[PDB]
RNA sequence: GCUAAACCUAGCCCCAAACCCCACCUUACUACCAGACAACCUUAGCCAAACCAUUUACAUAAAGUAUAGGCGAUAGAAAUUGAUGGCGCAAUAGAUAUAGUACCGCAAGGGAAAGAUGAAAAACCAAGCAUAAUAUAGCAAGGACUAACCCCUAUACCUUCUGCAUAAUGAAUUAACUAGAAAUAACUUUGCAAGGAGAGCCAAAGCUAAGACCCCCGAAACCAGACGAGCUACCUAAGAACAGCUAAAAGAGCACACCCGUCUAUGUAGCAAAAUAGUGGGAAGAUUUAUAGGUAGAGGCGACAAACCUACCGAGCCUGGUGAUAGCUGGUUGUCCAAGAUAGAAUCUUAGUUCAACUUUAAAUUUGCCCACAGAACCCUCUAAAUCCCCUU
RNA sequence: ACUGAACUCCUCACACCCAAUUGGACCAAUCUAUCACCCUAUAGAAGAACUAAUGUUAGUAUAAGUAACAUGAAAACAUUCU
RNA sequence: UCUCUUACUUUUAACCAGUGAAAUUGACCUGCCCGUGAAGAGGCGGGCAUAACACAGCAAGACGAGAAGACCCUAUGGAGCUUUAAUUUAUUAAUGCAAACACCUGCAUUAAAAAUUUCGGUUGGGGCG
């Protein structure tokens, strides 16, 4: 009889309560006998770096110069990454300079994005 | 009145939101009989006889009557010594102080309606003087009207405006009954 | 108790603002301007009742005829119902017949 | 309040705005034009004026078309502008009697037709009126090509028209291959109806179909900005080198 | 509003209803009093008295041919083509005292009116005007502004 | 009748009145006597002569017909040869 | 015929109001 | 809502002249929004009306009604404030000149009845007001004796005039 | 002196102008598996016709004309002509709106209420009562009186009616809200005038303009489209319960649980919008029952009781047409004056209406009432009060 | 003989007692136009006036402090007892 | 059960304390008898009675509360049902004729099924006559 309360797995008969989740991404599948097969590749692997020797504390000293915000753009990235090599080889096949015709064949395809975060 | 368009409107019991179902049965409840919660009797119900839509009050007096009214206004001003004829509205300066002082010295009213032949040719001095004043109002001859003549205590006219008004108002006398709207060509009507 | 216990804030009306000062000007535009413009053309307001007057039924009929296609859906439904009711009332009810 | 535009102009405004704007001009004009269909279920008045016998005066007479309901099954066949008449009758043909809802349906026949231009046999549910029209036009191809949309009254008919017109425009060698003389004879016979292939493509397309066709025509995967910036930089460096 | 009944409720029967007795305006047989009324031609009368009055006051100039346009311009007659008026008919009224010599063109004319016009040395001709031409001639300036 | 038409907002005319009565511009309504074409074989010559006559109406009947017809039907009609032309005005009428 | 008029319940807010 | 009773303690009289009777002190106290029917409180107010402070406290201490305790607390507070702030010399030298119960702001509730029907309960609240006047309680109005009663009758007889005449 | 009282702006109304990260169709707001399934089809009815059945509306001018029409209620062209805010609301108003929220309903859906300080809070008045219960007797007052009562006079109001104090209706009371809309033709006042009007229209003193007359609430109903078989009727799938005793494979007996509801008492605004206590029928079957699904209103279902279909089914409920209609009932709000009660006819008509009669207003004119003789039938032998007519007055 | 009306006279003044209906003279408040400026005037407008509709909303009464409702006992408030 | 009722217990009840409704209500300073009257008086006329108020019972009256009487009549108000009431066959089923070469379509005829609508008035209440 309650319509304004959110629909959660805590409401409904046993089948409903079992079937609905809470947003947790699936980790595997179910086989005969309701046995859960967990796939390792489906478990997110936290790629935590080595923080030893890292010099960047969470906060920044207040005695730090203030600089104008310059959001990175495609043009800026091209100028700072590709333009030098392009100029050199023009003075002296874009794959050599860096362009990749197709995202297929890459582990990290930019579009459609296939990596987390 | 003729310009008036009252924008007052109220929702009738048919336009008030809801009010479709019968609040309760005819008989057995012991309460008054009703057919909807939006009848005029109910709080928040419709208005039985309220203002309806934008209503117009437009009506036209005969142009002869309106011209005669203009004539009567002019005669009243002249008889009561509120009419002042001028050769021109040219002022020595555009200062509103000069105009107010001149009116006070000549014993004009607190309010003066100055009239000039045409809007475009009105002198710059008088335009500047009267733009800054509230009771000294400068109008073209074509704008003369009974309401403003009565609102303003004194009426200042120029000689060209006098001739203009005489011609326009007298034509109504001795004009035929129209064959078609006077905006259309006539043998002798400008 | 339906009477206020304090004087309402004084209402000051400027009798010589521009609107009141120039009210009525160009009402004689026709007779004083070679009848180039009819005074009704000085009326600013709803398109369907500029220089026109009538009872409620006539006003509703004119509104539907002139701006009916541009009316909102529920407003037009209300206008149709109002025209129906006004027709019934004026043509079937009243002291005189 | 009031809408800026009458509600009945909203479809035209949508046509003027959006992908419909990018639609080709000829197709848009074909959609706009609304030539009245040929009378089918009513006898049109002979002239614009008639001497009414009651008072012996010349009065204007107008042809008010009878509304026709075309069931969707008709769009799969060729009914010669014929359809269901959904109306009412007075029992015993006297207005003082009861009024009853009456539906007049056409007599539909399954027939097989051969299209010379398409060189194919079509089995089509057809009406005797359509058969008479085909006889008058001297063939199914002539009937399809001559009959306008408003009289053809069939999406299948308009699709056949588009196919015939496209083959005429392309002079398709697929028409009777290994028989160029026959192909040329057919195309010459139906020569007068030939139109530019661009128009023939859009002939007989509904508004939604035209929208889809335009979308497919103008869908281009975005060009990587790498290429654009490379072209711009190369051009700029060329200018620097030249000057 | 009275007391109860239909009158107070504002629901009294339509006009012409007689309480169920066959109404007066329906128990009378139909007769063709007004059949074709909208197709009958109508001619505004122009008495010779009126014509002489106009000529005397100078609203109609007898030195030039007088026709429907001149009459309307002088305001001697008001023609309503939309109301099936087909023009002007001369009328013998005032014939005995008519003296002006005029060349007048009208649509109808009585024998006595023609006699008076011709006795005074004038000329009279009956000229037909179909509704469109009648409207144009009565109000030429609006027609000239139509641009046709 | 229809005091305000739904399409024009004007007052309508009861055409049953137009089909039966003639209005003289003076304000009189002429009519034919009921039954003037019925069962004439059983009616005497005097009765037939009475029934074959055109007749006026009461003040109240005239007012009713004026209400039921619009102003167009009360205009001045200059028909070519109106059999009732002379009857469109009253002469030597006192009050 | 049996005549029964269903009870009418007043809106609950009127009762539930509090200081 | 009105709160004039509280303000009544803030009135300051001009200094009395030496040849002037000493003005008895007046202390206005009240308690607002007591969960008690004003009708029931009225009986307690009437009971303690006109009595000395000590006698009123004595009666209230042994009366059983709930409002008795509330009125006793109010009276004790009135005594304390009269001594501390209003310069009343003796605690006991005070008498209840005024004591009344006023309607408070009540709350409406629903009482469910047998057949889907209901009634509107009222969570009744009441105010309580007291004025304490310094000095011994005024003597009770003695019943009028036969002598004074006959005196009034004879005065009525003497007041007679010849009505409706010169 | 308490309840309280007020308050001005939150907003809204009418016009003009202007065109407007992730999740989610599965049980929505649910990361991740072979689909196939796809939209179009006259509105009806109320209502009017005083029933109802054909029928009944959904710029200006031509014109409410031509035409249509149980030729009646009514419907109704075309040619042709030319085409910048507020004498608005201001918290019961204005949007329903502080909100489509709270709350109510299974659902469609229905749908509210209200707030007020100040520059800064980092500073006297409704009802109801209380002060202060009451004294013989009486529509509660009036005439009065020295005096409150005592004395004398006085049968609340509204509506309906022949007639009401009526033991006929409504009303506890305060506050707020709550009900006469308009043509034709007339009348008054202007303007112009044989012409008037700012095309059209009228005109044998007319035309133009203005002023001034036409209410509110209420049915059972009818039709359209949605929503409903979580109750209940029946059914489908797959489940569950039925102690003990007698008998023996039982629509068997006694009798728990369980189902039902015979009779009584209580209750009747109740514990309960159908209950409680006792009593009672069945209780291995045509039984009872949990779960999910199905049949939907021109219908369903029915061991027919016109049963039951979400508490009110002779046909559900919601929304809409809809402000349905009501000759029926009720209501119809400032002061003051004046005139004002009156024959009948027709009518599916006698609860109404149209005409007449009466009544009202304005205007023109001259006779109006009372009434002297004379006069108004025989049938009928006699046979009345009178009447009609009628100068004078 | 007297008492006895709103009959009649007397002093003064007089439009100042019939339902439905009809004619007329005024008019409360509001807004607009001009006045006025401690509450107004001449006009134009209109959601323009409520002792009554088992009227609607809100407040408070009357019925009424009434009908109804509730907590087994002692105690150290551990506990025990019925 | 009753002749024929009595006793006791519990509940209710009454008093004290807390909490606290409902229908109803024109105003009431709310008497009895006879008469009157809109045809049965607390209020009117003639008499009689009459300090003031609480509390508990009673049910003769307030034509008591409750439901705008389900009885009866009326309404040119409804609806349900039946028909051998009037009007229809739009719809299905048949046939027959066309159309096509059995189905479909059009037109007729007959049935089934239904659909819309009505059920006059006077009347010594209505009905019957
Ligand atoms: N009648 C009316 N005029 C409006 C309305 N809104 C704005 N105006 C007028 O619009 C004009 C310009 O309004 P402003 O706000 O001053 O200027 P703006 O924003 O440029 O105006 P818009 O272009 O109209 O939005 C003024 O004359 C306003 O009175 C409205 O709702 N009705
Ligand atoms: Mg509605
Ligand atoms: Mg209703
Ligand atoms: Mg509202
Ligand atoms: Mg009444
Ligand atoms: Mg009556
Ligand atoms: Mg009849
Ligand atoms: Mg319940
Ligand atoms: Mg209470
Ligand atoms: Mg009807
Ligand atoms: Mg009616
Ligand atoms: Mg046209
Ligand atoms: Mg509101
Ligand atoms: Mg008070
Ligand atoms: Mg009574
Ligand atoms: Mg009654
Ligand atoms: Mg009562
Ligand atoms: Mg079920
Ligand atoms: Mg067993
Ligand atoms: Mg058994
Ligand atoms: Mg049976
Ligand atoms: Mg039965
Ligand atoms: Mg139900
Ligand atoms: Mg009604
Ligand atoms: Mg009188
Ligand atoms: Mg006397
Ligand atoms: Mg005023
Ligand atoms: Mg009002
Ligand atoms: Mg009030
Ligand atoms: Mg009331
Ligand atoms: Mg109480
Ligand atoms: Mg009691
Ligand atoms: Mg009790
Ligand atoms: Mg108690
Ligand atoms: Mg008696
Ligand atoms: Mg008692
Ligand atoms: Mg009584
Ligand atoms: Mg009784
Ligand atoms: Mg009773
Ligand atoms: Mg009744
Ligand atoms: Mg019965
Ligand atoms: Mg009926």
Coordinates of C-alpha atoms in Angstrom, one line a residue, chain H residues 29-126:
Chain H
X29 CA 0.9 36.0 38.8
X30 CA -0.3 33.3 36.4
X31 CA 0.4 30.0 34.9
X32 CA -0.3 29.3 31.2
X33 CA -1.3 26.2 29.3
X34 CA -2.2 24.0 32.2
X35 CA -3.4 20.6 31.1
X36 CA -6.7 21.0 32.9
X37 CA -10.2 22.0 32.0
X38 CA -10.9 25.7 32.8
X39 CA -14.3 24.6 34.1
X40 CA -12.7 22.4 36.7
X41 CA -10.1 25.0 37.5
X42 CA -12.9 27.6 38.2
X43 CA -14.0 25.7 41.3
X44 CA -10.6 25.8 42.8
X45 CA -10.2 29.5 41.9
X46 CA -13.6 30.3 43.5
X47 CA -12.7 28.3 46.6
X48 CA -9.5 30.2 47.3
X49 CA -10.9 33.5 46.1
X50 CA -11.0 36.2 48.9
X51 CA -9.0 34.1 51.4
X52 CA -5.6 34.8 53.0
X53 CA -2.5 33.2 51.3
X54 CA -2.0 30.8 54.2
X55 CA -5.6 29.7 54.3
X56 CA -5.7 29.2 50.6
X57 CA -2.5 27.1 50.7
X58 CA -4.0 25.0 53.6
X59 CA -7.2 24.3 51.7
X60 CA -5.3 23.4 48.5
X61 CA -2.9 21.1 50.2
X62 CA -5.8 18.9 51.2
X63 CA -8.0 19.2 48.2
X64 CA -7.8 16.2 46.0
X65 CA -8.2 17.8 42.5
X66 CA -5.2 17.9 40.3
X67 CA -5.5 21.6 39.8
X68 CA -5.1 22.1 43.5
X69 CA -1.4 21.3 43.3
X70 CA -0.9 23.6 40.3
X71 CA -2.7 26.5 42.1
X72 CA -0.6 25.8 45.2
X73 CA 2.6 26.1 43.2
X74 CA 1.4 29.3 41.6
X75 CA 0.5 30.8 45.0
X76 CA 3.8 29.8 46.4
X77 CA 5.6 31.4 43.5
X78 CA 3.4 34.5 43.9
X79 CA 4.3 34.7 47.6
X80 CA 8.0 34.4 46.8
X81 CA 8.0 37.1 44.2
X82 CA 5.9 39.4 46.4
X83 CA 8.5 39.2 49.2
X84 CA 11.5 39.4 46.9
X85 CA 10.6 41.9 44.3
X86 CA 7.4 43.8 45.4
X87 CA 8.6 44.8 48.8
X88 CA 5.9 42.8 50.8
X89 CA 7.1 42.7 54.4
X90 CA 5.4 39.6 55.7
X91 CA 4.7 36.4 53.8
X92 CA 1.4 35.7 55.5
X93 CA 0.1 39.3 55.0
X94 CA -1.3 38.5 51.6
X95 CA -4.8 37.6 50.4
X96 CA -6.2 36.4 47.1
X97 CA -8.1 39.4 45.7
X98 CA -8.6 37.8 42.3
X99 CA -8.4 34.2 41.1
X100 CA -9.8 33.0 37.8
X101 CA -9.3 30.3 35.2
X102 CA -9.0 31.2 31.5
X103 CA -9.3 29.0 28.4
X104 CA -6.0 28.0 26.9
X105 CA -5.0 27.0 23.4
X106 CA -6.6 23.6 22.9
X107 CA -5.8 20.8 20.5
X108 CA -8.3 18.9 18.4
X109 CA -8.2 15.1 18.2
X110 CA -10.5 12.4 16.8
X111 CA -12.6 10.0 18.9
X112 CA -13.6 6.9 17.0
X113 CA -17.2 5.7 17.3
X114 CA -19.0 2.5 16.6
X115 CA -20.0 2.7 12.9
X116 CA -17.2 4.5 11.2
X117 CA -18.4 7.7 12.8
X118 CA -16.3 10.0 15.0
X119 CA -16.2 12.9 17.3
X120 CA -13.8 15.8 17.8
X121 CA -12.0 15.6 21.1
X122 CA -10.3 18.7 22.5
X123 CA -7.1 18.3 24.5
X124 CA -8.2 21.1 26.9
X125 CA -5.8 23.5 28.3
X126 CA -6.4 26.4 30.8

